[PDB]
Write a protein that binds this DNA or RNA. Structure first.
Ligand SMILES: [K+]
Length: 324
DNA sequence: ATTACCGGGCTCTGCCATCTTA
DNA sequence: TAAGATGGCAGAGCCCGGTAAT
């Protein structure tokens, strides 16, 4: 009865809430008051509170005791209340989609038990919160799958493969095993690719590749291949290029292309580009802004050493001065 | 005094489908 | 027997600078 009124004064988007979790609105008891007070208690602005509820209405079904206990467990990993407010604003669902604090506590035990440091649990919680709402078994699955995948390739102690990858790729424990398998076999196939090459690739520069959704990797590589072929680069060169800079698989196809095109419209050859893959770190805006500045001076770009295009502001700005 | 090499810092939700659970 | 709990999916970059090399 009193439910819609409170939410309305709270700033909530009621129509949106009802669409996401209609069920919640057919309960006779809801604790929307205690939650407001609870988050207010921990420093959340009223606008955040509304935003959290607008996106995860079920949040209002939790009791002060539960909320307080879950919060204190997060504070076993994160150090300030503010850190947690921020995470919840960014992703409500991770905190509120479960109310099994025992399970949560077991995740924390398990993850410690795998040999991860607190800075590593902190990193996980901060950037991949939803890790801690996983079932214990689900986190166990992924960990067992990595160990198995560690030894299924030539790794000396899998225990440490797990730590390296989980540190380099914080988002791995919120991916399905299905998905991460398919991304590994995608790399193994498309490129050489013997166990050791593969292993560094996964731990180092191609670590983010394991998070790509189904076939989005395959599809984004296809585009790379076409667009580079079209410009006169051979498959070898395409492979060499992408392996020396796998980040390029994460770009939206359209971005890659526009990026390639903005560079080349200025008479920078496809050759300069793939022998200096990092120029592609820069957003298109930055590239575009820098291109303007240099051609504005006496630079011809056709023959310049274009590495500066992806230098830091400092080093770039310094060098631009010197050119004029 | 200048650039290359390379790794690190940031960084991941919001939706739907299929169970459990009471 | 309807909600709650849980799993899984699509979508996706940019920047900085230490230190080696010259
Ligand atoms: K109920």
């Amino acid at each position: 009865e009193d439910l819609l009124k409170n939410l309305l004064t709270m700033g909530v988007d009621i129509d949106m809430a009802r669409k996401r979790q209609p069920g919640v609105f057919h309960r006779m008891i809801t604790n929307e008051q205690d939650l407001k007070m609870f988050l207010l208690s921990k420093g959340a602005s009223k606008e955040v509170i509304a935003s959290i509820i607008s996106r995860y209405p079920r949040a209002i079904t939790r009791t002060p005791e539960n909320l307080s206990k879950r919060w204190d467990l997060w504070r076993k990993i994160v150090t300030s209340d503010l850190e947690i407010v921020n995470i919840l604003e960014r992703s409500p669902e991770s905190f509120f989609r479960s109310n099994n604090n025992l399970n949560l506590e077991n995740n924390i035990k398990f993850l410690y038990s795998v040999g991860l440091t607190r800075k590593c649990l902190c990193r996980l919680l901060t950037n991949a919160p939803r890790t801690f709402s996983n079932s214990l078994d689900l986190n166990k699955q992924m960990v067992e799958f990595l160990q198995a995948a560690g030894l299924s390739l030539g790794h000396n102690d899998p225990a440490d493969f797990v730590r390296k990858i989980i540190f380099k790729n914080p988002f791995i424990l919120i991916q399905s095993t299905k998905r991460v398998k398919a991304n590994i076999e995608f790399l193994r196939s498309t490129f050489n690719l013997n166990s050791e090459e593969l292993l560094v690739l996964i731990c180092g520069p191609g670590a983010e590749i394991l998070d790509l959704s189904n076939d989005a990797a395959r599809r984004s590589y296809a585009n790379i291949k076409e667009k580079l072929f079209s410009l006169g680069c051979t498959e070898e060169e395409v492979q060499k290029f992408v392996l020396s800079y796998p980040d390029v698989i994460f770009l939206a196809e359209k971005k890659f292309n526009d990026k390639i095109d903005c560079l080349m419209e200025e008479n920078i050859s496809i050759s300069q580009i793939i022998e200096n893959p990092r120029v592609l770190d820069s957003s298109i805006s930055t590239l575009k802004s820098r291109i303007k500045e240099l051609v504005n001076a006496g630079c011809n770009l056709s023959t310049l050493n274009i590495t500066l295009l992806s230098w830091s502001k400092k080093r770039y700005e310094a060098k631009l001065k010197k050119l004029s």
